[PDB]
């Protein structure tokens, strides 16, 4: 089957990329260092930015369940690519360290 | 003594538990390079005494969408095993995400 193009990221609860899987190069055309330290919202279409902020805020409330969101991500060629980001929190219960968010980011079609 | 993140590695799998991605943290912990795990099933590395339980957990993951494994043993590259526990999550099915936390040093 045709494998979907995806990459994994880790974010703090504000949305900042704190880890970027190198499969990002094939997905969106950036090197990981171009994403690290930036907010995901800095790559998001203006119409979708608030949804994306809202999403990151709610995923922390949903008891580790998956929260997905579709949005337009600006590729390295400055083109809007539809992304489905499926996010969940990870908190290690041997600790009280703050949870972070794990995402899997897939190029998808905006169609049925 | 290690901090929490240095004992955590994320792995991604197809629905048959073959590795499709793994964090490089695994190398320092268990010995493997991520590249060498790709295409191998996680089942190849579970201790025999945990294999039936890990099958059951995989079935539970596939039915429910998320699972916590309980404690199990994973085979290290240079023999022996480490104790670890895994939070698994299915992404839609597209893949399984596993957050793996090492509980022990390598034991023979």
UniProtKB/Swiss-Prot annotation, chain A:
Where does the record place the PAC domain? 68-111
Annotated PAS domain residues: 1-63
Q: Which residues form the signal peptide?
A: none
Location comes to: Nucleus
Q: What does this gene product do?
A: Required for activity of the AHR. Upon ligand binding, AHR translocates into the nucleus, where it heterodimerizes with ARNT and induces transcription by binding to xenobiotic response elements (XRE). Not required for the ligand-binding subunit to translocate from the cytosol to the nucleus after ligand binding. The complex initiates transcription of genes involved in the regulation of a variety of biological processes, including angiogenesis, hematopoiesis, drug and lipid metabolism, cell motility and immune modulation.
Q: How does it assemble?
A: Monomer. Homodimer only upon binding to a DNA. Efficient DNA binding requires dimerization with another bHLH protein. Interacts with TACC3. Interacts with HIF1A, EPAS1, NPAS1 and NPAS3; forms a heterodimer that binds core DNA sequence 5'-TACGTG-3' within the hypoxia response element (HRE) of target gene promoters. Forms a heterodimer with AHRR, as well as with other bHLH proteins. Interacts with NOCA7. Interacts with TACC3.
From the Swiss-Prot or TrEMBL record, give the protein name: Aryl hydrocarbon receptor nuclear translocator
Tell me what organism the protein belongs to. Answer: Homo sapiens
Query: Which gene name does the record give?
Result: ARNT
Q: Which residues of the full protein are shown?
A: 357 to 468 of 789
UniProtKB/Swiss-Prot annotation, chain B:
Post-translation changes: The hydroxylated prolines promote interaction with VHL, initiating rapid ubiquitination and subsequent proteasomal degradation. Under hypoxia, proline hydroxylation is impaired and ubiquitination is attenuated, resulting in stabilization. Phosphorylated on multiple sites in the CTAD.
The stretch of residues making up the signal peptide is none
Query: The PAC domain covers which part of the protein?
Result: 69-106
Which tissues is this chain's protein expressed in? Expressed in most tissues, with highest levels in placenta, lung and heart. Selectively expressed in endothelial cells.
Q: Where in the cell is it found?
A: Nucleus; Nucleus speckle
Can you give the residue ranges of the PAS domain?
A: 4-65
Record note on quaternary structure? Interacts with HIF3A. Efficient DNA binding requires dimerization with another bHLH protein. Heterodimerizes with ARNT; heterodimer binds to core DNA sequence 5'-TACGTG-3' within the hypoxia response element (HRE) of target gene promoters. Interacts with CREBBP. Interacts with EGLN1. Interacts with VHL. (Microbial infection) Interacts with Kaposi's sarcoma-associated herpesvirus/HHV-8 protein ORF34; this interaction results in increased stability of EPAS1 and thus activation of its transcriptional activity.
Which disease does the UniProt record connect it to?
A: Erythrocytosis, familial, 4: An autosomal dominant disorder characterized by elevated serum hemoglobin and hematocrit, and normal platelet and leukocyte counts.
The job of this chain, per UniProt, is described as:
Transcription factor involved in the induction of oxygen regulated genes. Heterodimerizes with ARNT; heterodimer binds to core DNA sequence 5'-TACGTG-3' within the hypoxia response element (HRE) of target gene promoters. Regulates the vascular endothelial growth factor (VEGF) expression and seems to be implicated in the development of blood vessels and the tubular system of lung. May also play a role in the formation of the endothelium that gives rise to the blood brain barrier. Potent activator of the Tie-2 tyrosine kinase expression.
**What protein am I looking at?**
Endothelial PAS domain-containing protein 1
- Which species is this record about? Homo sapiens
Which gene holds the coding sequence for this protein? EPAS1
């Amino acid at each position: 089957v045709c494998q979907p193009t995806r990459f994994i990221s880790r974010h703090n609860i504000e949305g900042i990329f704190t880890f970027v899987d190198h499969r990002c190069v094939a997905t969106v055309g950036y090197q990981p260092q171009e994403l690290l330290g930036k907010n995901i919202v800095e790559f998001c279409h203006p119409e979708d930015q608030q949804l994306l902020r809202d999403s990151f805020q709610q995923v922390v409330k949903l008891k580790g369940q998956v929260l997905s969101v579709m949005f337009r991500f600006r590729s390295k060629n400055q083109e809007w690519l539809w992304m489905r980001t499926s996010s969940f929190t990870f908190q290690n219960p041997y600790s009280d360290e703050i949870e972070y968010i794990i995402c899997t980011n897939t190029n998808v079609k905006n169609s049925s | 003594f290690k901090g929490l993140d240095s004992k955590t590695f994320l792995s991604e799998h197809s629905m048959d538990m073959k590795f499709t991605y793994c964090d490089d943290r695994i190398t320092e912990l268990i010995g493997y390079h991520p590249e060498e795990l790709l295409g191998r099933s996680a089942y190849e590395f579970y201790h025999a005494l945990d294999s039936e339980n890990m099958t059951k957990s995989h079935q539970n993951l596939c039915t429910k969408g998320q699972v916590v494994s309980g404690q199990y043993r994973m085979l290290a590259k240079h023999g022996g095993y480490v104790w670890l526990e895994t939070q698994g999550t299915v992404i839609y099915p597209q893949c399984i995400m596993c957050v793996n936390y090492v509980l022990s040093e390598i034991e023979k």
